[PDB]
UniProtKB/Swiss-Prot annotation:
Interacts with NGFR. Interacts with NTRK1. Interacts with SORT1. The chain holds residues 127 to 228 of 228 of the full protein. It comes from the Eukaryota. This is Death domain-containing membrane protein NRADD. It is found in: Cell membrane; Nucleus. The gene is Nradd. It comes from Mus musculus.
């Protein structure tokens, strides 16, 4: 049961890499530009991070680094959820374990 509160930004390496790979999944995105602009990223910025190899990590890093606020991963899950990305949310927020043997 949920009584306390799992780690949002302090998520486990498993969940961390899981999301990073998800965004860069083999499947071609269907709205990368709209995302960059929507977030408020300049053409120079989007092109900068894009050039790198780890855009997911660089994006979240530069974000919290530049913002230096108390913003958490929730900012991404929400900003993205607005587009209607439930698939990624399901893979990232998979269901818990069961009691039965199988």
């Amino acid at each position: 049961p949920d009584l306390g509160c799992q780690l949002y930004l302090h998520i486990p390496q498993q969940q961390q890499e899981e999301v990073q790979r998800l965004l860069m999944m083999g499947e071609p995105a269907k709205g990368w530009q709209e995302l960059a602009g929507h977030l408020g990223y300049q053409a120079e910025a989007v092109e900068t991070m894009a050039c790198d190899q780890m855009p997911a990590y660089t994006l979240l890093r530069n974000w919290a680094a530049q913002e230096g606020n108390r913003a958490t991963l929730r900012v991404l899950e929400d900003a993205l959820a607005a587009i209607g990305r439930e698939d990624v949310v399901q893979v990232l927020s998979s269901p818990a374990e069961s009691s039965s043997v199988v």
